Every structure is written in C-alpha cells, then in structure tokens.
Write a protein that binds this ligand. Structure first.
Ligand SMILES: Nc1nc2c(ncn2[C@@H]2O[C@H](COP(=O)(O)OP(=O)(O)O)[C@@H](O)[C@H]2O)c(=O)[nH]1
Ligand SMILES: [Mg+2]
Length: 386
C-alpha cells in the first residue's frame, strides 16, 4: 500500500488556499491518476464536530506516484486555530500559501507561530498569484520575507522549498502553470519525510482500569498507544505518585493469553510486585526512561464559544479548571500572557499551567479543559517545564 501522509493548506485569507487545493487534486488527477475536486466543493466545507467544537473542514485526497495524501483545507482563520489544536489528524507537513500581490500578512505569521506551537514538523511554501506579477525583483523580495518569517519561528527558512505558481491559472488548465503544481507535489514527496509510526515509538499505555486477578496479581487495562510490551520486559508506572518500576508477567486480550501487546490493541497487562492500590487514575505504563512526569507546561488553548456548549462569561487569572489528560481530570492553576487580563469564550491564548498532580507528558500531547464534568476548552502541550 502507498504511504499515507497528512498535509493541508495554511496562510492568510484570500491568498489562495482553496484554489490551490482544487488545483493540486485536478493536476495530479490528470497527470498521475485520481479524482479531481472543484473549487466550489472545497470552499463549501462541511461542519465537522470534534467533541462540542465545530470546525468547518474540507477533506480532500490525492496521490503522487509514491504517496497517498490526506489534505485539509478550511474556510476561515478560526477553523485553522481549532484544527491545529484539536483537528482529527495532526499535520505531517503544511503548505503555506502566500500571495505575491500581498506578501506575508498577519495570519501568515499566526499560522507559522501556531504550527510551531502545536508541533507541525515541515512547512513548504507556495508563492501564489504569480500570474499577476511580471517583476522578478518583487518576487525575490517576497521570497526573502517568507524565509525570514519561517526562520523567526525556528523553521529552516533558508532550506525551505518555495514554488512560484498560480493556483488559479493551473486550475483553469494552463499547462505552464500546471507544471508548478507538479513541482509542489514533487516537494511533498521529497521534503516531507514519512512520519514515525506509533508501533516504532517507545511503549506507552494509558491506564484505564485495575483489577486484582485471583492467583495472578495486579492487572492494568488500556489501549496500547504506541510501541510493543512483551512478557518479561520492564515497565515504569509514570504519573500522580513517585514513579515505580515493574515487570510484565502476562498480556491478556479478553480471555486470550498473549506474549505481547501492540499499538492499537486493547489489552490487560499483568504486573509483578505492584499492589492494586499502588495504581492511580491518570497513570501510564511506559518504556523506562522515555517519558517523564510534569506539573508545569506551556500550551496553546482554544476556549469553546457559548454556541459550542462552553462558558458564557470570560474567566480571569484566578481560573482553576480541570485539565483532562488521557484518562482523568487534574486541577490546575494558570498564568495568562502579559497584557491579557480576561479570556473571552471563543478566544485562543498561550497558557502556562500548573497541575496539582504530575502527569506523564511530552510536547504535542493534547488535553481538554473542563469545569464540573463538562468540556470548556481544548489545548496542546507546547513546552513542558517541569
Ligand atoms: N490571479 C490569481 N488569482 C487567484 C489565484 N489563486 C486564487 N486566486 C483568487 O483569489 C481569490 C481567493 O482565493 P481562495 O482560494 O478562495 O483564497 P483562500 O481564502 O486562501 O482559500 C479567488 O478569487 C481566487 O480565484 C492565482 O493564482 N492568481
Ligand atoms: Mg478558502
């Protein structure tokens, strides 16, 4: 099967993301095979529901000779904010569209900054509307502006592929400009490395339940998030309390006794030496020395709007909600950015959080913000602090 890669268009409004998305599907369909999509179908994005969050998202698919791509395009900036923090698939790379007529605009900066925060790993640039620009001096100056902006947020601007093109003329059928769509698709193939598959990451299992099995000791159940756990291998129980070491003495799937549990499977793991009461809501099983527990972190959060089922009134710096990490709520206190004293429903802000219990975490881990039982926001860990 062809490798699967998740991409999407980002960049400022009216710079040509949707026209480019249509052009890519159209050009690749007539060149390497597939199904073309038209501008109107993609611009008219369905409402996708992620929890209570409403995100207008168009999903499109296209193939290169060697890869299958799932591409995400959204109508408005508000959708890109929501999608980057809580969208169905995390982008493996992004196509930043920049209109040569306008140059980098405020959401060009914001989407790069968000990409950095939510951990978007590769960004390719399509410099659009070049059918309007005859001057090569201008095009060079815009290209340098985009490279500086990428580097400002630690992307490798100097080595970043930038394709000078015209999404519109390519969608209209002009073969000269279509070649630029193939150049861009070439860069998707060559510049975005194939992402790391979960089965190859160090073992991780969020604990959902614990039982004292008769004559066999303590078992913890959960979905293997990544890696492989084998009978005989050592594990760490990470989070809430001081970290404990243990050994796997059995892997059970329903009534079937296994020798290993793999990423994606729902299993029960028998642990030597651990008593049922030594296990707490919110802990994970992990390969030893691969994930650490933290109480403090920086995050990018989106606060739900009233219509989405969230808060009706803003909160202030004393806000003390619950942060739901994998399996449980942990209370935290927050610090706001300087100048911000109030956070309105529907806002998104950088939030420094201090939980009252440690949670095993790494950059890019998603969480929900909750009040009482109900969800009021969504975040991504941008930087762990300790
Ligand atoms: N002249 C020219 N116009 C373009 C090009 N790409 C897009 N446009 C026009 O710019 C407008 C906005 O494009 P659109 O894809 O909807 O922008 P989006 O908000 O980023 O999705 C539309 O009128 C497009 O047809 C291009 O390469 N050349
Ligand atoms: Mg659009």
């Amino acid at each position: 099967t062809k490798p699967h890669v998740n991409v999407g268009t980002i960049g400022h409004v009216d710079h040509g993301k949707t026209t480019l998305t249509a052009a890519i599907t159209t050009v690749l369909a007539k060149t390497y095979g597939g199904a073309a999509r038209a501008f109107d179908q993609i611009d008219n994005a369905p409402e996708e529901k992620a929890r209570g969050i409403t995100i207008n998202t168009s999903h499109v698919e296209y193939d290169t000779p060697t890869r299958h791509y799932a591409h995400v395009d959204c109508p408005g900036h508000a959708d890109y904010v929501k999608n980057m923090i809580t969208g169905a698939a995390q982008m493996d790379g992004a196509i930043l569209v920049v209109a040569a007529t306008d140059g980098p605009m405020p959401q060009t900066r914001e989407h790069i900054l968000l990409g950095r925060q939510v951990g978007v790993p590769y960004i390719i640039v399509f410099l659009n509307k070049c059918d309007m620009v005859d001057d090569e001096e201008l095009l060079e100056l815009v290209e340098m502006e985009v490279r500086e902006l990428l580097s400002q947020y630690d992307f490798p601007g100097d080595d970043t592929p930038i394709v000078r093109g015209s999404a519109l003329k390519a969608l209209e059928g002009d073969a000269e400009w279509e070649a630029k769509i193939l150049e861009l698709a070439g860069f998707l193939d060559s510049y975005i490395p194939e992402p790391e598959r979960a089965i190859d990451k160090p073992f991780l299992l969020p604990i959902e339940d614990v039982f004292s099995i008769s004559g066999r000791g303590t078992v913890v159940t959960g979905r293997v998030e990544r890696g492989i756990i084998k009978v005989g291998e050592e594990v760490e129980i990470v989070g809430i309390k001081e970290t404990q070491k243990s050994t796997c003495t059995g892997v059970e799937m329903f009534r079937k006794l296994l020798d290993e549990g793999r990423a994606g499977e729902n299993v029960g793991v028998l642990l030597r030496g651990i008593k049922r009461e030594e296990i707490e809501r919110g802990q994970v099983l992990a390969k030893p020395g691969t994930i650490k527990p933290h109480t403090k972190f920086e995050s990018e959060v989106y606060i739900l709007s009233k219509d989405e089922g969230g808060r009706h009134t803003p909160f202030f710096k004393g806000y003390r909600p619950q942060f739901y990490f994998r399996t449980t709520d942990v209370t935290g206190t927050i610090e706001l950015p300087e100048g911000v004293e109030m956070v309105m429903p529907g806002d998104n802000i950088k939030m420094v959080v201090t939980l009252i219990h440690p949670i095993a975490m790494d950059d890019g881990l998603r969480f929900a913000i909750r009040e009482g039982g109900r969800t009021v926001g969504a975040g991504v860990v941008a930087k762990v602090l300790g």
